[PDB]
Design an enzyme around this catalytic site. Sequence first.
Site, PDB file in Angstrom:
ATOM      1  N   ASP A  29       0.801  -1.229   0.000  1.00 44.54           N
ATOM      2  CA  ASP A  29       0.000   0.000   0.000  1.00 44.54           C
ATOM      3  C   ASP A  29       0.826   1.267   0.000  1.00 44.54           C
ATOM      4  O   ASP A  29       1.294   1.750   1.045  1.00 44.54           O
ATOM      5  CB  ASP A  29      -0.916  -0.080   1.249  1.00 44.54           C
ATOM      6  CG  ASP A  29      -1.951   1.015   1.321  1.00 44.54           C
ATOM      7  OD1 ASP A  29      -1.921   1.934   0.428  1.00 44.54           O
ATOM      8  OD2 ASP A  29      -2.818   1.029   2.248  1.00 44.54           O
ATOM      9  N   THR A  30       1.026   1.865  -1.194  1.00 38.66           N
ATOM     10  CA  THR A  30       1.864   3.054  -1.246  1.00 38.66           C
ATOM     11  C   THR A  30       1.202   4.246  -0.585  1.00 38.66           C
ATOM     12  O   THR A  30       1.906   5.252  -0.287  1.00 38.66           O
ATOM     13  CB  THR A  30       2.204   3.423  -2.707  1.00 38.66           C
ATOM     14  OG1 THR A  30       0.966   3.630  -3.428  1.00 38.66           O
ATOM     15  CG2 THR A  30       2.974   2.296  -3.400  1.00 38.66           C
ATOM     16  N   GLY A  31      -0.085   4.197  -0.326  1.00 39.75           N
ATOM     17  CA  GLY A  31      -0.774   5.312   0.349  1.00 39.75           C
ATOM     18  C   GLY A  31      -0.684   5.170   1.854  1.00 39.75           C
ATOM     19  O   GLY A  31      -1.245   6.050   2.541  1.00 39.75           O
TER      20      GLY A  31
HETATM   21  C1  LIG Z   1      -6.944   1.017   4.248  1.00 36.57           C
HETATM   22  C2  LIG Z   1      -6.852   0.667   2.761  1.00 36.57           C
HETATM   23  C3  LIG Z   1      -7.254  -0.807   2.543  1.00 36.57           C
HETATM   24  C4  LIG Z   1      -7.731   1.561   1.879  1.00 36.57           C
HETATM   25  N1  LIG Z   1      -7.454   2.959   2.043  1.00 36.57           N
HETATM   26  C5  LIG Z   1      -6.392   3.506   1.232  1.00 36.57           C
HETATM   27  C6  LIG Z   1      -5.114   3.655   2.051  1.00 36.57           C
HETATM   28  O1  LIG Z   1      -4.025   3.753   1.132  1.00 36.57           O
HETATM   29  C7  LIG Z   1      -5.113   4.837   3.013  1.00 36.57           C
HETATM   30  C8  LIG Z   1      -5.011   6.191   2.314  1.00 36.57           C
HETATM   31  C9  LIG Z   1      -5.161   7.366   3.294  1.00 36.57           C
HETATM   32  C10 LIG Z   1      -4.101   8.236   3.525  1.00 36.57           C
HETATM   33  C11 LIG Z   1      -4.220   9.274   4.451  1.00 36.57           C
HETATM   34  C12 LIG Z   1      -5.434   9.474   5.098  1.00 36.57           C
HETATM   35  C13 LIG Z   1      -6.516   8.638   4.838  1.00 36.57           C
HETATM   36  C14 LIG Z   1      -6.376   7.585   3.948  1.00 36.57           C
HETATM   37  N2  LIG Z   1      -3.988   4.715   3.931  1.00 36.57           N
HETATM   38  C15 LIG Z   1      -4.043   4.585   5.259  1.00 36.57           C
HETATM   39  O2  LIG Z   1      -5.077   4.466   5.916  1.00 36.57           O
HETATM   40  O3  LIG Z   1      -2.815   4.642   5.865  1.00 36.57           O
HETATM   41  C16 LIG Z   1      -2.835   4.745   7.280  1.00 36.57           C
HETATM   42  C17 LIG Z   1      -1.671   3.894   7.819  1.00 36.57           C
HETATM   43  O4  LIG Z   1      -0.523   4.685   7.499  1.00 36.57           O
HETATM   44  C18 LIG Z   1      -0.874   6.058   7.707  1.00 36.57           C
HETATM   45  O5  LIG Z   1      -0.407   6.907   6.660  1.00 36.57           O
HETATM   46  C19 LIG Z   1      -1.467   7.092   5.753  1.00 36.57           C
HETATM   47  C20 LIG Z   1      -2.697   7.234   6.678  1.00 36.57           C
HETATM   48  C21 LIG Z   1      -2.386   6.141   7.713  1.00 36.57           C
HETATM   49  S1  LIG Z   1      -8.744   3.947   2.168  1.00 36.57           S
HETATM   50  O6  LIG Z   1      -8.230   5.364   2.240  1.00 36.57           O
HETATM   51  O7  LIG Z   1      -9.422   3.644   3.468  1.00 36.57           O
HETATM   52  C22 LIG Z   1      -9.800   3.756   0.790  1.00 36.57           C
HETATM   53  C23 LIG Z   1     -10.958   2.981   0.788  1.00 36.57           C
HETATM   54  C24 LIG Z   1     -11.775   2.857  -0.342  1.00 36.57           C
HETATM   55  C25 LIG Z   1     -11.421   3.534  -1.512  1.00 36.57           C
HETATM   56  N3  LIG Z   1     -12.465   3.218  -2.542  1.00 36.57           N
HETATM   57  C26 LIG Z   1     -10.274   4.304  -1.514  1.00 36.57           C
HETATM   58  C27 LIG Z   1      -9.473   4.417  -0.387  1.00 36.57           C
END
Ligand SMILES: CC(C)CN(C[C@@H](O)[C@H](Cc1ccccc1)NC(=O)O[C@H]1CO[C@H]2OCC[C@H]21)S(=O)(=O)c1ccc(N)cc1
Lengths: 103, 99
Positions: A29-31
Site C-alpha cells: 500500500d503506497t498510500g
Molecule cells: C486502508 C486501505 C485498505 C484503503 N485505504 C487507502 C489507504 O491507502 C489509506 C489512504 C489514506 C491516507 C491518508 C489518510 C486517509 C487515507 N492509507 C491509510 O489508511 O494509511 C494509514 C496507515 O498509514 C498512515 O499513513 C497514511 C494514513 C495512515 S482507504 O483510504 O481507506 C480507501 C478505501 C476505499 C477507496 N475506494 C479508496 C481508499
Amino acid sequence: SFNFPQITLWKRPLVTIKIGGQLKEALLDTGADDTVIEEMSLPGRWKPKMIGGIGGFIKVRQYDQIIIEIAGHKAIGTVLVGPTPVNIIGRNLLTQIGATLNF
Amino acid sequence: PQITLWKRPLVTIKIGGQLKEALLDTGADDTVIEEMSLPGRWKPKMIGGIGGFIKVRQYDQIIIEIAGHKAIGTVLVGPTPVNIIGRNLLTQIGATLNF
Ligand SMILES: CC(C)CN(C[C@@H](O)[C@H](Cc1ccccc1)NC(=O)O[C@H]1CO[C@H]2OCC[C@H]21)S(=O)(=O)c1ccc(N)cc1
Ligand SMILES: [Cl-]
Ligand SMILES: [Cl-]
Ligand SMILES: [Cl-]
Ligand code: NA
C-alpha cells in the site's frame, strides 16, 4: 494481471507475509505511511498510537524492530497492530524490500 | 517514471478544471477526492477504510489529468482526509509496482 498477485494494478497487489512464524495475506500500500496488521502477539515492548485513515482514527500498538518477510523479502522494522480491515504493508517496509512505483 | 517511497508519492492532478494534490495509492481500489463539484449525474455510495465508512458521491466517466497523463474513470467525492488516486485510475497512467 501480471504476477504476484499483480504488477499493473488491475487486481489488488496482495502478497503473503510471514510474521511470528505465521503466514498472512497483506496489501502492498503506497498510500500507507506505516504497516498495520490485524490483532496478533508480537514480542517485546509496544506503545499506543492512533492513526487516521478515510472513516477516522483507530488506536494501534506500535512494535519496533519486528522481523517480517514480505513476498519472500526480509524486512525488520515497525509493525502497528490493531483493528484494520486489511493487513497493510506501508512505505516504512516497502522501502526496505526495494519496492518502487514506476510510470 | 520511477517513484521512490521514501516520502509520500504525491502528484498534482487536474480535475473539474481545478488543480489538486493527490496521493498515488496502490492500497485504494477507487479514486476518492475531497468535496468539490463535478458535472453530470451521480449516485450515493459508502466506502470503508481504517477507521470505518464515509458516504461519497459516485461520478462516472470523469476525465482527469494525473501528473500530466489524461485518464478517464469513476471518481468518488466526499469527506476523505487526503485526495487519493486509486487503482481504477493508476492503471490508466500505466503505473506499476515493482520489487
Ligand atoms: C486502508 C486501505 C485498505 C484503503 N485505504 C487507502 C489507504 O491507502 C489509506 C489512504 C489514506 C491516507 C491518508 C489518510 C486517509 C487515507 N492509507 C491509510 O489508511 O494509511 C494509514 C496507515 O498509514 C498512515 O499513513 C497514511 C494514513 C495512515 S482507504 O483510504 O481507506 C480507501 C478505501 C476505499 C477507496 N475506494 C479508496 C481508499
Ligand atoms: Cl507473495
Ligand atoms: Cl520501520
Ligand atoms: Cl473506473
Ligand atoms: Na458522469
